[PDB]
Design a protein around this ligand. Sequence first.
Ligand SMILES: *[C@@H]1O[C@H](CO)[C@@H](O)[C@H](O)[C@H]1NC(C)=O
Ligand SMILES: *[C@@H]1O[C@H](CO)[C@@H](O)[C@H](O)[C@H]1NC(C)=O
Ligand SMILES: *[C@@H]1O[C@H](CO)[C@@H](O)[C@H](O)[C@H]1NC(C)=O
Lengths: 258, 124
Amino acid sequence: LQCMQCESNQSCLVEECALGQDLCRTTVLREWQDDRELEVVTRGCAHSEKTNRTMSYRMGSMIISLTETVCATNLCNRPRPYLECASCTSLDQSCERGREQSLQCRYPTEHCIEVVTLQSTERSLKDEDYTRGCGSLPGCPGTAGFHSNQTFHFLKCCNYTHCNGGPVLDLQSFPPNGFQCYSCEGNNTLGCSSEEASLINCRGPMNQCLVATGLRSYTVRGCATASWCQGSHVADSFPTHLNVSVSCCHGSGCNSPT
Amino acid sequence: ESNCGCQNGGVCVSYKYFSRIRRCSCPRKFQGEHCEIDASKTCYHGNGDSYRGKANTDTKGRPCLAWNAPAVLQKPYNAHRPDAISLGLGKHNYCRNPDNQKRPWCYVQIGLRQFVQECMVHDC
Ligand SMILES: *[C@@H]1O[C@H](CO)[C@@H](O)[C@H](O)[C@H]1NC(C)=O
Ligand SMILES: *[C@@H]1O[C@H](CO)[C@@H](O)[C@H](O)[C@H]1NC(C)=O
Ligand SMILES: *[C@@H]1O[C@H](CO)[C@@H](O)[C@H](O)[C@H]1NC(C)=O
């Protein structure tokens, strides 16, 4: 599939997708504050399964509004670009304090959302820890999530007023359900094994043992939902990669090196 | 940290569901997509090669055209330049002086054409 590609300040190329990629991403990011709108678009080939998605929140005196739009025709990306929910980011220390300026979605179909990303040491991702805002993402009304020894992601999405205020969401807020998984991140096959990867004690809503991969060749296993394990999520769970073959099943050792 | 193009006290924050797209979280002094903009600057120093301020008009009144502009993208000095980052030229409308030139200037519409006119920014 031919489709325009171009990061921020670049001009666009006629990129052309391979067997696997069948959609055309056109991500825009905007900010308003003190009457200064600044907006950054990136385009390129998308993939098998991503979804017209939307998010917005406010940090301090500004509102950032992310939106993504996809289509499966030739160069369909081109030249040109209410319900109340609590808002705040981890970044400005506002989601952590028992106070957090709020906001009201500007599209019917939007939702209320909390998104959590917790990472250790020198962390691969430049994503806020906690974010609360308005919008729609993969498998919305409901929830997704997955935890590892060193990592924990989780989304929550609801169609009801301020449905996302109150307590934030840490590890300890989850009932060690009793079921187990594995956690692995070295390099290829012998960075982790039955030797340098151990059994995690799965926590609460996480009960699916899961693996992940992509081509240099990074790989990750652990404990997840059925919504996480499904759709766009997992994929973006890490920088970029392949068709990112991914697997789920019931059982403690479900995700041990097959 | 920054290491995304985040000049000054810029903080790099990305966005998983939106294709690891990044934005910079600027301190008060530095506006713009990299915190590339010293919004306190009111005059320029020497000739201007360094000026990163926010003059946008010209010595007759007219406003500058965006280094973005479809118009300007034909002109040699514009925001898509591979070098544009270090030279200050970006999604704005300000004044720069990337090549040599007495002071900072910008591409100005007058009737139909795009003349390069001289900015206001007082010298120190
Ligand atoms: C990734 O993509 C292609 C789709 O054309 C697929 O055939 C290939 O086997 C995949 N690679 C894997 C699973 O290692
Ligand atoms: C995504 O956007 C297009 C055009 O913007 C819209 O017509 C289409 O229906 C959306 N995709 C889906 C699957 O609804
Ligand atoms: C969802 O919200 C819409 C209005 O936003 C409302 O009509 C409907 O009753 C809600 N339904 C559910 C299942 O949340």
